[PDB]
Write a protein that binds this ligand. Structure first.
Ligand SMILES: Cc1cc2nc3c(=O)[nH]c(=O)nc-3n(C[C@H](O)[C@H](O)[C@H](O)COP(=O)(O)OP(=O)(O)OC[C@H]3O[C@@H](n4cnc5c(N)ncnc54)[C@H](O)[C@@H]3O)c2cc1C
Ligand SMILES: NC(=O)c1ccc[n+]([C@@H]2O[C@H](COP(=O)([O-])OP(=O)(O)OC[C@H]3O[C@@H](n4cnc5c(N)ncnc54)[C@H](O)[C@@H]3O)[C@@H](O)[C@H]2O)c1
Ligand SMILES: OCc1ccc2c(c1)OCO2
Ligand SMILES: [Mg+2]
Lengths: 1214, 107, 54
């Protein structure tokens, strides 16, 4: 049995002094990075004046010769949308291979009217890209209805001539500007013209981000075939005069990441070596492009091995990009220069600024890391670039610097820095094809600056070029190429010296004012939890030790009653991934001690309620600090107890920290003396989020002033006991927080205990239904139902149309379905693929599935851990075999023999015929796939809704019409657009569903605490200016009937209702996180009196609901002559079980009537109903007898606004 | 249609053009239910006409028009209300219903 | 353009024929100018050979 964490994340090689200096700079504060760069980039006044003169001369030449799309737009008086629509049409017409067939379709069919009839895939799938081309502005999604209107308008106005011009323009742009050629042979033919003028080329076959082994093999053979063509054409010109190739490591392996470093070195490295050997034979350059910041240091391990590999000796063509926007850049250069010296290889070093800026900002914010790995002010990158050029220019004997930039100021500074002594091979400039030639035609050649420039030349088809053209175009307001074309930007502004500008700032290197550090995402409201960077070798080394130390701890969980730990039946807790690994011991609670704990909680209730809310909140904040400091140890326990990977354990601890800080802040915003606690609250939690949900429920109940009986899932008591220990250390008295480990019997004994005043349950729908039945017997001392929050299972779908990017979909599907072995309530269960793309996506999905590593989770390389128990495994496997027995296609990863010591289920894909093939939630790594025809999208949404669940839901589409349709029709609590459907963030995606998935209110949302007090406070931002019109019609009807007081109460309910609340919640860049209040649906009304009925109806209608009124009330004559608008919302029900599902209930009666009704409601099939009851006298006395908070449904929607490939808002941030 | 607005000229020609900015991403949900019902009946051409009407309808357009500072000038497209349908044939009725429902109307 | 250049004369006629004040006569002529230019622009945005007149 291997020791826990003994092989967690060993580095590829021992970290040298130079490598350690790189890692140390990874997220160094920006104020610390800039001063040495300013110093290194400083040049003499004489040079600075000469550089400014050269830059001005270049810029004057550029502006003096400065259109294709612009001239088309001008000639035909096109609006921007017409221009975009025209280019999309042209793109689609160019997918027709035969020119005569295309021209015939244009002349006969397209021009003469209905283009829609002749052209499964929206014409406008790539309209965000064309929008960038036409307008210079990036939109994340496409207003396809606006584009369709614009296309119809422009064709009907201008006819075939405009279509012809659009087609010819798109053909030129896609075949000659965005790429040098469609194929390497075409690109090579077209390169002769500029090679004869002194340019060189580096060809990019556009491979990137392989998703499957087959993808990686295709990109490999593309590179290999290109090397042959380039080498044949180079014909002995060598690496400086002759052409080369550029590759992306991410194209060559589907798991190119630090977590998979062993596979990278074993499988990716030999592929690079084979390509390098071919480049060596032809004596051409082979450049490794730089990608995301978390791949930089890993790529250095490949560069090191290749440069030390004697089989490659004699060839100086190996090249490597370094990104000056990165804080590690100068230290990377020190490492590379030293590697060049040690190996004797003159490494070609391409200095760039960097292509992933927006994405790096978003990623660091999402991951809660200390700082960014890139600068946040554009001028800092410019200074970094010039400083790094000074370092490179001092080492031209051992490296070949390649200065890639389109910025004339940057170019001029380096041209003068390098000096007058020049020979080919000393250094070169580089630029992008179809972008940099105007500038470099003022550089290359004896009549200019007589410096060479290598053109980075994309090569590929329309489909390949469009994939990441958005990133390449960002054209941002800060970009030189955008500014050169802005008439409002002066040449003096363009030749401004970034070195001297930075030097003169009041704080050198200050972070951008408009970019939040990850810790500050929420500003003054609360401190964001911090994560850990699993790509940082220092973090991995320290985590390895802390994780090993955590496995040497004698973790226990005991019944921690107010009076101290209690005795009970004791058993070991075993690692689900390896039963030989004993994690700890749990002493379970007797049912007698559970009842005693509730009595102790009841006795302690006044003392805890008397702790002021601010001080209760301070305990939560202290617990958050303790959990943050203890995170490494907590990770180790979660990893071993709950089958979680390190990434998922980090997220788990972060969520716990966030719950604590969120409920603390919500308390400070709301709770006062009039919001009395319920009393002892029983918190019952699931195994699968064994710290986060556990902590969230308890923290909320405690901070609302209730003592808590905490019953953690029987599978995961140890982390729960540690959470209770931390809360107690933070100041929660033992009498206010009692831990009661044990199985469902302990939960049931707590629920049934006489003094239990509320129940917070997260777990399966079936168990919640048992608790609902238990509580249907029960009333509070005030004769009212015991509040139950029951957050339950999901049958979560993602719909993908033909506009979605398959690689993006597959990544989000693999994560959503199989992260944590599908043991997230939010996990993707049903992927719905539009028929026209289903086969391609399914092929990619199966290929990605087979790249997952399943095993014991104390290794960073493990993607998917075990299922929690053998019973869970048996239940999941029974489902898989049932499906397999029905003839459904089943794809499963093969499991390693090492899984035999634990309980594992391989990630599984099951292709279904109908969504009705599924019965109940299957809580495991089982993704079901359904296909749908586009016209059946609305029926499909019905089918998803028809399961009765309503937890998470995903939609991948670029089309606004589809987003609007699907999000308006889906009925789920957490929606996700163009991203995964998991990892909801507290206070950002308040989490919780409807129907079989939850009663609400949402955890991590603003209505939660109000359920845990007897009188709900007004949550922050909780109001709506909108009044339900059916409520208004009802109020007028009431006045017409003479029910004047009820009409006034109805109007008051109309105003008090927060139906229609529509907020954007603060969060990371590149995402829009929305929170809205909608109607719940159909509310069951059980009235006793006419006035009670009118009050119930007003409450329900004011919150947008329809109603089913108990026909046994005999109150039919009280609703005579309703306006049609109100009648449409009213039904009468003699058989409540026949007229559901309902989404809540309002009950009027005395205590025994309430109890009887509550029992009947609990017996209704389907969802647990949030019931509110009041007596007739309470209705008369209290305008809030029925609280409107619980008659609306919260919906959270998270939209990935970077999905098009860039962040529009951050294009304005420089 | 309103004078000084974008629908006006289209009333004065025998085939109306698509006015500038005249579209909406919203689809009437009753139209959608009608299309599914047509689908189930095998009324394939009518279901297609219904879906097309749902998409081309500009119901829900909600624009701010350029104007002076210190003023917000909004232009929105709502349902007309209740439309009188005088069909002759079943298919004609289905097409009329599609047009009226797609634009948010009752009939 | 002609109405704009002749607005002072048009105002005089509108003031005396229709009982308008000078400010309201200005608004009247401006609105006529705006209709002319608006329908001109809307035409340039929309009308093609298939939009036959009544
Ligand atoms: C031939 C060639 C090869 C390239 N290869 C690669 C590669 O392998 N990997 C890669 O990542 N990039 C690469 N790039 C660069 C990237 O694609 C952009 O072209 C480059 O960063 C633009 O810089 P510029 O000096 O031409 O323009 P500029 O307008 O001078 O600089 C723009 C750059 O500034 C940076 N920036 C913008 N805003 C901010 C901000 N708020 N804070 C900090 N920095 C900011 C970004 O890096 C941005 O690209 C390459 C570029 C060329 C010309
Ligand atoms: N909606 C959400 O936010 C959310 C979050 C996480 C998990 N879940 C759901 O939780 C489930 C997985 O967790 P689980 O396997 O631990 O669920 P579960 O229903 O098996 O157990 C949950 C808890 O209820 C207790 N319990 C069992 N029987 C009981 C009874 N008769 N009376 C009182 N308590 C009883 C258990 O001991 C445990 O503490 C999944 O269905 C998942 O979808 C929902
Ligand atoms: O557009 C220039 C460019 C070249 C190579 C790249 C890149 C951008 O991003 C990462 O690799
Ligand atoms: Mg269970």
């Amino acid at each position: 049995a291997p020791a826990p964490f003994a092989d967690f994340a060993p580095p590829v090689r021992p970290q040298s002094t130079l490598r350690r200096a790189i890692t140390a700079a990874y997220r160094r504060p920006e104020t610390e990075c800039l001063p040495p760069l300013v110093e290194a980039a400083t040049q003499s006044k004489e040079i600075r004046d000469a550089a400014a003169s050269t830059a001005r001369k270049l810029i004057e030449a550029l502006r003096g010769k400065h259109s294709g799309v612009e001239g088309l737009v001008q000639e035909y008086s096109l609006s921007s949308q017409e221009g975009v629509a025209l280019m999309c049409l042209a793109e689609a017409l160019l997918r027709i291979p035969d020119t005569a067939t295309r021209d015939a379709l244009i002349r006969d069919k397209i021009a003469d009217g209905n283009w829609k009839s002749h052209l499964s895939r929206s014409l406008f799938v790539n309209a965000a890209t064309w929008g960038l081309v036409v307008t210079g502005k990036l939109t994340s999604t496409v207003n396809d209805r606006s584009l369709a209107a614009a296309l119809t308008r422009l064709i009907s106005r201008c006819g075939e001539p405009v279509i012809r011009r659009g087609v010819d323009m798109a053909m030129r742009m896609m075949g000659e500007q965005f790429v040098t050629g469609e194929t390497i042979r075409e690109a090579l033919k077209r390169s002769k013209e500029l090679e004869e003028k002194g340019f060189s080329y580096s060809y990019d076959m556009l491979g990137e981000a392989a998703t499957t082994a087959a993808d990686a093999e295709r990109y490999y053979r593309d590179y290999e075939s290109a090397i042959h063509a380039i080498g044949k054409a180079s014909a002995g010109r060598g690496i400086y005069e002759g052409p080369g190739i550029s590759i992306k490591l991410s194209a060559l392996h589907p798991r190119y990441s630090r977590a998979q470093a062993a596979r990278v070195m074993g499988e990716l490295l030999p592929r690079v070596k084979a390509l390098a050997l071919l480049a060596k034979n032809y004596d051409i350059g082979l450049n490794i492009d730089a990608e995301e910041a978390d791949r930089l240091e890993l790529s250095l391990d490949l560069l090191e091995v290749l440069c030390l590999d004697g089989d490659l000796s004699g060839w100086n063509g190996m090249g490597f990009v370094v990104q000056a926007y990165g804080k590690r850049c100068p230290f990377v250069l020190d490492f590379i220069i030293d590697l060049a010296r040690r190996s004797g290889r003159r490494i070609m070093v391409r200095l760039v600024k960097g292509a992933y800026w927006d994405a790096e900002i978003k990623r660091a914010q999402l991951d809660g890391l200390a700082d960014f790995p890139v600068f946040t002010r554009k001028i800092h990158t410019d200074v970094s670039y010039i400083a790094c050029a000074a370092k490179l220019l001092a080492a031209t004997d051992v490296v070949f610097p390649q200065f890639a930039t389109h910025n004339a100021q940057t170019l001029a500074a380096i041209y003068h820095m390098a000096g007058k002594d020049f020979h080919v091979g000393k250094y070169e400039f580089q630029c992008l094809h179809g972008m940099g030639e105007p500038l470099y035609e003022e550089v290359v050649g004896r009549g200019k600056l007589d410096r060479p420039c290598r053109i980075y030349a994309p090569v590929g088809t329309h489909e390949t070029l469009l994939a990441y053209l958005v990133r390449r175009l960002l054209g941002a307001n800060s970009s030189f190429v955008h500014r050169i074309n802005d008439p409002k930007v002066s040449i003096d502004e363009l030749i401004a010296d970034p070195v001297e500008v930075v030097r003169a700032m009041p704080v050198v290197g200050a972070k951008h004012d408009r970019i939040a550090l990850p810790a500050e995402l929420f500003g003054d409201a609360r401190t964001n939890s911090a994560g850990l960077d699993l790509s940082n070798e220092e973090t991995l080394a320290s985590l390895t030790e802390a994780l090993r130390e955590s496995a040497a701890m004698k973790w226990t969980a005991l019944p921690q009653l107010a009076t101290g730990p209690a005795a009970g039946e004791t058993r070991t807790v075993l690692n689900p991934g390896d039963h030989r690994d004993v994690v700890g011991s749990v002493t379970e609670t007797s049912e007698e001690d559970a009842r005693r704990a509730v009595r102790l909680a009841a006795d302690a209730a006044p003392d805890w309620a008397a702790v002021p809310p601010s001080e209760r909140a301070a305990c939560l904040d202290r617990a958050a600090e303790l959990m943050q400091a203890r995170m490494p140890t907590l990770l180790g326990l979660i990893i071993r107890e709950a089958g979680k990977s390190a990434l998922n354990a980090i997220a788990e601890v972060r969520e716990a920290i966030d719950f604590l800080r969120y409920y603390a802040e919500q308390t400070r915003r709301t709770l006062g003396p009039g919001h009395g606690p319920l009393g002892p609250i029983v918190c019952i939690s699931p195994w699968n989020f064994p710290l986060a949900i556990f902590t969230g429920q308890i923290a909320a109940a405690l901070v609302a002033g209730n003592p808590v009986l905490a019953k953690p899932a029987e599978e995961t008591p140890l982390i729960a006991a540690e959470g209770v220990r931390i809360l107690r250390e933070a100041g929660i008295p033992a009498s206010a927080l009692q831990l009661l480990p044990g199985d469902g019997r302990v939960g049931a004994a707590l629920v049934a205990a006489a003094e239990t005043a509320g129940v917070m349950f997260t777990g399966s729908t079936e168990v919640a239904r048992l608790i609902q039945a238990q509580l249907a017997d029960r009333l509070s001392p005030a004769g009212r139902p015991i509040p139950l929050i029951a957050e339950t299972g999901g049958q979560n779908a993602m719909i993908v149309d033909s506009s979605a990017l398959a690689e993006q979909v597959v990544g989000d599907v693999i994560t959503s379905a199989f992260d944590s072995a599908g043991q997230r309530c939010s996990a993707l269960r049903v992927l719905c693929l539009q028929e026209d793309v289903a086969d391609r996506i399914l092929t990619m999905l199966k290929g990605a599935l087979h790249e997952l590593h399943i095993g014991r989770t104390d290794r960073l390389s493990v993607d998917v851990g075990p299922v929690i128990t053998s019973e869970a495994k048996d239940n999941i496997e029974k489902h898989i075999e049932r499906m397999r027995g029905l003839g459904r296609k089943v794809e499963q990863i093969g499991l390693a023999s090492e899984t035999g010591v634990g309980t594992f289920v391989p990630p599984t894909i099951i292709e279904l015929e109908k969504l009705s093939d599924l019965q109940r939630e299957v809580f495991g790594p089982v993704l079901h796939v359904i296909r749908y025809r586009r016209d059946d999208l609305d029926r499909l949404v019905d089918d998803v809704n028809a399961t009765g669940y309503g937890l998470t839901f995903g939609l991948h589409t670029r089309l606004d019409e589809t987003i609007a349709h699907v999000t308006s029709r889906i009925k789920a609590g957490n929606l996700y657009i163009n991203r995964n459907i998991i990892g909801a963030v507290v206070g950002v995606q308040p989490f919780g569903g409807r129907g079989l998935s939850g009663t609400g209110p949402k955890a991590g949302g603003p209505l939660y605490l109000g359920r845990l007090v007897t009188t709900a406070p007004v949550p922050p931002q909780h109001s709506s200016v909108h009044t339900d019109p059916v409520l208004l019609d009802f109020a007028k009807w009431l006045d017409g009937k003479g029910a004047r007081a009820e009409a006034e109460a109805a109007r008051n309910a109309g105003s008090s209702s927060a139906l229609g609340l529509d907020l954007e919640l603060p969060g990371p860049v590149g995402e829009r996180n929305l929170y809205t209040l909608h109607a719940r649906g159909r509310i069951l009304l059980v009235p006793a009196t006419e006035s009670g009925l009118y009050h119930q109806l007003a409450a329900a209608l004011a919150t947008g609901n329809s109603v089913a009124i108990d026909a046994a009330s005999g109150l039919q004559a009280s609703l005579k002559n309703l306006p049609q608008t109100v009648g449409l919302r009213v039904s009468w029900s003699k058989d409540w079980a026949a007229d559901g599902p309902f989404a809540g209930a309002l009950v009027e009666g005395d205590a025994e009537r309430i109890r009887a009704v509550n029992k009947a409601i609990a017996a209704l099939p389907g969802p647990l109903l949030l019931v509110q009851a009041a007596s007739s006298g309470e209705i008369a006395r209290n305008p809030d007898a029925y609280c409107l908070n619980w008659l609306v449904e919260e919906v959270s929607a998270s939209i990935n606004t970077a999905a098009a490939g860039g962040n529009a808002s951050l294009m304005a941030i420089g």
